[PDB]
Each structure stands twice: as structure tokens, then as C-alpha cells.
């Protein structure tokens, strides 16, 4: 299994952002699948996570009201609507799958996608 993801890219303060990921490869399961992101020289932290049917969600607090995670159509799609961003939320985000809760013990990672908020 393997993740794509796609939706990064530089934009101004106060703008939006919606970052996709999608499994490749043959999946025997329906994925739990999260969203983490990391800035230079710190960790890959947990920004949010959605279980396999969609039923459940988990947050990192300094996100929640502003970013919204959420499945897509086809399966093990998982998408990250980010919303009102600032110029902290500037990182590389990483798509994971396989696992739960705010750990990076997750099965399966992306490589990652970079998003600058720039005030303008
Ligand atoms: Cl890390
Ligand atoms: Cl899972």
C-alpha cells in the first residue's frame, strides 16, 4: 500500500487549502486514515484522523473550527479541508493510514506535501 497525496501549495493568510490522499496498491481493508505535518528540524505531529467508515473523528486542538477531515468517494481516499490558514500552518503535510490515535505508529505514510501561508 502506498499514499498519494496532492492539494498543497503557497497561499496567502486567510486563505484556504485542501489537501487529498488516496491509497495505491492492492488494500485488504478499509483504512483509518489521518493527516500529520512537520516543520523543519521538529517531528511529524498529528493534525487530524477520520476511521474507516467515517463515523469518527479526532483533532488536534490547535486546528479544530478551522481545518475539517473527511472521506472521499473512492476507497481509502481521506481529504483535509483547511480553513482561515496562518502562516504557523505553513509545513509539510503527511497523509498516513493504518492505525489510530496521535502516534506515528501508523502502517503507512505519504512523502509528503508542502504548504506555506505567506501574509500578503
Ligand atoms: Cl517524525
Ligand atoms: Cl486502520
Known amino acids: 500500500v502506498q499514499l498519494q497525496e496532492s492539494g498543497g501549495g503557497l497561499v496567502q493568510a486567510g486563505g484556504s487549502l485542501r489537501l487529498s490522499c488516496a491509497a495505491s496498491?492492492?488494500?485488504?481493508?478499509?483504512?483509518?486514515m489521518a493527516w500529520f505535518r512537520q516543520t523543519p528540524g521538529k517531528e511529524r505531529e498529528f493534525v487530524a484522523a477520520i476511521t474507516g467508515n467515517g463515523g469518527t473523528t479526532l483533532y488536534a486542538d490547535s486546528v479544530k473550527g478551522r481545518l475539517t477531515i473527511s472521506r472521499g468517494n473512492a476507497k481509502n481516499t481521506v481529504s483535509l479541508q483547511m480553513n482561515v490558514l496562518k502562516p504557523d500552518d505553513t509545513a509539510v503535510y503527511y497523509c498516513?493510514?493504518?492505525?489510530?490515535?496521535?502516534?506515528?505508529?501508523?502502517?503507512?505514510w505519504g512523502q509528503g506535501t508542502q504548504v506555506t501561508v505567506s501574509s500578503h
Open positions: 496498491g492492492r488494500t485488504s481493508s478499509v483504512y483509518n
Open positions: 498516513a493510514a493504518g492505525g489510530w490515535g496521535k502516534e506515528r505508529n501508523y502502517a503507512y
